[PDB]
Symmetry: C3
Subunit: 486 residues, 3 copies
């Protein structure tokens, strides 16, 4: 009725606060941050193929503006478009600009195929001061500016190209909009001009609009660009009585389009990463990030929270006595253990089986806590220079809805896991204490502070027998029962 | 101190592995699959109304192309459009094609109301070799091809139809695009022609485009189709100086539009089902499915996982001893039970109160696991032949976002339920053991292995006295304090 | 071997049913409703700025139609548009109506800046009988109707306005569509007319349409309105040879656009609230609502459920005996407590340490049950008069997808919280019982029904010593052991 064995668990000076279903803050021994808030100051060029547009945005790249030669034959997973790209050529607009941009970026390559168009008596290769290469008048190198012959003739053009190949073709073509009627007749003789571009299933007809626009690089006239896709087995007809800016061929479309585009000033560095934000690449294993909604590749999911702490250890209770409202700051060899006092003194030893059992249930979630890929490439635009209305509203609302739902999932998840982690480790403590209860049987009594008063001689070999589960209660039974009741 | 009663739980040779919050794989006695991965090889024509377009797609159905007569008067919950549908009439296009198709699908019936239009001196009922019925030249039978009179007169047309009814009217009309100026004056005399269709609050004006288009079904010309919706108390005015393909009346719109369209080659069978995918119908009560994101009717929610197993039973521990690290493979008429050893031998018997308490907290959830009927009809397109740009990007991003969110929910729901199922069944085991302990009081001792050593002779009906809660402890108390402490 | 002490928990006659992971229904003691199903019959004018359009919708207010002068200089968080607003001016359409409305509403103010446009020889300030202001022919007061000079001339107009300020400018302009070729020449001399409006990088060109339309306020002619945004550093050019409806200046755009529009007939009141639906404002602290998906401000999230009850107390079991299947209706000053019966009589007293622990895990959850701000202003349209097709489908699908994910989150959250609530309160009951067991040690025995039979003389200060944990087991042990075993 003198030796005492105690059951306890580790503790630390002070640990980390986390969130559960119940409490707002519960202190625990160890915790891990789940939200990435650090980004590299650069974009990583591997394992994804990044292509830098430099002074050239993707549209001018497709058109073949001065400055964009370095993009011929390029292939990308991610086109890096620079916010300070500048127009260097003839002033132009693109009805449905964003859509052409999406198609080009998504396709993932600038593989251009020349074709000779046997245009009639019209002069070809028109050039301009608004589009100089060095100081020489030039034009978009994928386009061919047709004007009237020296004989003041511009006859009806009528050319056909059949796609009997195994890939869809992208034709880019334009319509010139002169500033005055004299300009119209000087260039194209006919007034009005006109363009019809047709496949078997679709047709685009364009009437030039004559009139003065603001001066840009010396020009008040404009080109509007359009595009036509021609599937294998389809064909394209170009029809014009003037103002056509002819294609010089076509781009090849990949059957499967898996590329995308990222607009950022962030430089391309030397690192390795599969995750790219417009702030730079991510290098992390965390399941969430608060850096940018604009994330391309294999990325953590974007959430609003700055921090989410996942408990990786038990509740931390600080400060001859086992668990009850006590933790052993001395126990540094395990999560649970034994603390005794017999004739030969005291001693603190860790319990392995219960420590391991706790660990495999808390770091059982290890593995499942970033399960899933989230490998996304082409997505949608998520920032805008100016309001445009209905379509943009919808894009903003979609992304906002997404972020709120994932932010919520992240909040609930951590709370649920922490609740479970707390419950598992409290349960493993009780299980240990109960296991000991069942070995001692009637040779001991529950002190009430996580300790057993052992009612018999128990030397260190006997103490050990308890810890490694070999203690036979019958050996000490009648010795013990006597000390208990008489 | 010789008779023993044991508390335990059933087990089987091999159980099913399932996920929890902790362990990635826990073996339970029984489990149920929640992801449907099987489909029927056909579409089921009840209880929903399916209409098979056969060689006719819904747009051609609406126009009244040859081969679409079977659609006249049709009504559907789901219109089945075939990938092998073909054009059988004059080559045409439809600006905002997708939208007219959507409206027609959603509306859910082809109920056409003929109207007499008193067109002027112009000739009516133009026909074409490109649109034969039984080797006789013809045209769309909802449309009326107006050409100039025999006296070379196409007078300005100006007719009005007033909606005095109680439903909105859908008018479909077109503009013809000739291939040459000669053609434009051969049919309509005037050049240019022109069409205006207007209501009180809207207008549409179309200028014909002239130009060569690829020969299709003998024609380089085209019709462009448009539509006008006329609400009750509004009216429609048709104005033309040429090239008008006139309506012969109007389609009736339902006020409430609840139908949709499904594009698939899958045959329509004889089976019964309320869930239709483009792979075929589903016949299932499972809450999720991995067959197709394209799913119409009363459907499981589409998820990315191939399998999610819901525990419908306790932990399965295989292999004179009760529960502690043992399950009884021989207990096959209950979940929890008694096993005993006494003077007359041994026996195993089931306990039903504990079994039923466990079943009620577990099957009580597979009923709340089959609840949200999610009945969705008209949704959005989810696969595409070719990229289009901004709008198609948004649609795909929306569907992809939805799918990832529901896949996460599915993964979490099953881990949470499984964790709860295990906790409940482990708990009912302990509650049974504690129920017996309280019955015995000081007449028995905990042997450590989920067994009580009864320190008095307890015969086979003393055993059943324990199993039924009648065991009076003071009937053996003196005969039990005895061999325990003397 | 005579006095008894019991441990128990409160109850009420009538409790409320809640949902958990297991049970369809669990009766608990107290429960809180989480879904707000009540709205005020009015819109609260504080703390957000509401501007009432009254007879004027936002488009007419921007144009300056008769009756909209109250909206001059208006600024709003939410513009209240009335479904019975009437047109009071020249019949018009807006090709991209919803986008212009969205931009206007989102911007949040009507700040007009007049400018002097020195139009050439054309006459200005055209007015109309279809647009009377105070019984005199007038026009949109933000617009300038140009017509030909008395010299029967309409020369090419070519004006330029430079944006050299620090804000983006919104110009609204229109194009007039005559009914006859005679009207065209009477007003504008030239036939056809024509308008081009352009900046450095964009352009809009319109060809007027001529033709008969239904009479609306005495006119078969129409105006179509367009708009042009001009960034700081950019400029705008108006080119026209007729039919231009010119601006009298521009609206100022905010850099940060944070406002929205709400279309409803509900009156503006004098209550306070930051949540506005189209059925009226909400005054609530509940996290969900089932009133309307259309909701602006700081609102509960919209869900499909009519009710979600969150348990705020333990299980409810109604009706000498302690907890095992019995709650105490008499215990009304605490959640848990003691019930004894010694020599001097009987008695009830609530235990506070256990009541406080439970409460600190249950109310510990219900104020980051709503932690969520959900501050949402400009969103998307969510109801429509008529089907339009693709974009509308996408809008409806997005909102339906959102509502289903939030309805699921609400359902699951309440079930998880309730299960945790039940488990906490069961857990604390047991921890109470165990604590007292730890105190008694070998001086008492578990009666089997929540009660401890004390085997020694115990008066009412001996009882209180148990209930404030001062009780010493050794004092009474020899007395107690003797009665137990002899
Ligand atoms: C004739 C032609 O195709 N290119 C010529 C253009 C076009 O006449 C204008 O751009 C018409 O818009 O005018 C230039 O002064 C120029 O832009 O440098 C010279 C150039 O050779
Ligand atoms: C030119 O147009 C005619 C139709 O008038 C067509 O038959 C022919 O194929 C066209 N030629 C080319 C080269 O496309
Ligand atoms: C991301 O979180 C950190 C703190 O974890 C915070 O300092 C930073 O501002 C956050 N990023 C934001 C709010 O954009
Ligand atoms: C014909 O046009 C006149 C005015 O040009 C109009 O008053 C009349 O209603 C039109 N007729 C029909 C049948 O629409
Ligand atoms: C659906 O799941 C099954 C496994 O249950 C798998 O074999 C099948 O390939 C899956 N279908 C997919 C991934 O399309
Ligand atoms: C008018 O047009 C001329 C060219 O025709 C152009 O140089 C000038 O800048 C324009 N002026 C204004 C005020 O728009
Ligand atoms: C909202 O819930 C209330 C009661 O919870 C119900 O009566 C009402 O019909 C619901 N509102 C709906 C379904 O719009």
């Amino acid at each position: 009725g003198n030796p005492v064995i105690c059951m306890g668990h580790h503790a630390v000076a002070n640990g980390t606060m986390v969130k559960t279903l119940a409490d707002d803050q519960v202190e625990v021994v160890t915790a891990q941050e789940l939200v990435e808030s650090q980004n590299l100051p650069e974009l990583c060029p591997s394992p994804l193929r990044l292509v830098d547009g430099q002074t050239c945005d993707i549209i001018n790249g497709a058109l073949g503006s001065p400055g964009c030669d370095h993009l011929n034959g390029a292939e990308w997973d991610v086109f890096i478009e620079r916010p300070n790209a500048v127009d260097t050529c003839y002033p132009f607009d693109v009805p449905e600009y964003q859509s052409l941009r999406s198609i080009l970026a998504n396709n993932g390559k600038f593989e251009f195929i020349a074709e000779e168009f046997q245009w009639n008596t019209v002069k070809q290769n028109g050039k301009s001061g608004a589009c100089k290469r060095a100081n020489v008048n030039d034009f978009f190198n994928r386009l061919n500016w047709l004007v009237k012959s020296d004989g003041n003739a511009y006859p009806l053009q009528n050319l056909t190209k059949i796609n009997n190949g195994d890939y869809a073709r992208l034709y880019i073509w334009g319509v010139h909009h002169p500033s005055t009627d004299t300009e119209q007749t000087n260039l194209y003789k006919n007034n009005p001009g006109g363009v019809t571009v047709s496949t078997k299933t679709s047709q685009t007809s364009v009437v030039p609009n004559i009139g003065s626009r603001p001066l840009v690089r010396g020009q008040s006239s404009r080109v509007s660009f359009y595009w036509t896709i021609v599937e294998p087995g389809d064909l394209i007809v170009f029809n014009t009585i003037g103002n056509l800016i002819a294609p010089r061929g076509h781009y090849k479309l990949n059957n499967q389009k898996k590329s995308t585009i990222l607009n950022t000033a962030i430089p391309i560095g030397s690192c390795v990463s599969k995750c790219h934000t417009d702030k730079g690449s991510l290098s992390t294993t965390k399941p969430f990030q608060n850096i940018s909604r604009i994330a391309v590749g294999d990325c953590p999911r974007y959430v609003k929270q700055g921090s989410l702490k996942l408990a990786t250890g038990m509740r931390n209770i600080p400060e001859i006595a086992g668990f009850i409202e006590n933790g052993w700051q001395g126990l540094i060899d395990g999560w649970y253990g034994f603390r005794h006092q017999n004739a030969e003194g005291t001693g603190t030893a860790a319990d392995l089986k219960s420590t391991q059992a706790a660990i495999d249930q808390i770091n059982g979630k290890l593995n499942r806590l970033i399960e899933k890929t989230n490998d996304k490439y082409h997505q949608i635009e998520k920032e805008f220079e100016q309001v445009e209305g209905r379509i943009q509203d919808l894009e903003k609302y979609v992304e906002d809805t997404k972020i709120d739902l994932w932010s919520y999932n992240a909040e609930l998840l951590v709370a649920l896991e922490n609740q479970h982690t707390i419950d598992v480790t409290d349960s493993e403590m009780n299980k240990l204490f109960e296991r000991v209860r069942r070995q001692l049987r009637e040779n001991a009594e529950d002190k009430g502070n996580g300790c057993f008063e052992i009612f018999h001689k128990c030397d260190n070999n006997c103490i050990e027998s308890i810890r490694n589960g070999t203690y036979d209660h019958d050996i000490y039974r009648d010795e013990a029962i006597n000390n208990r009741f008489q």
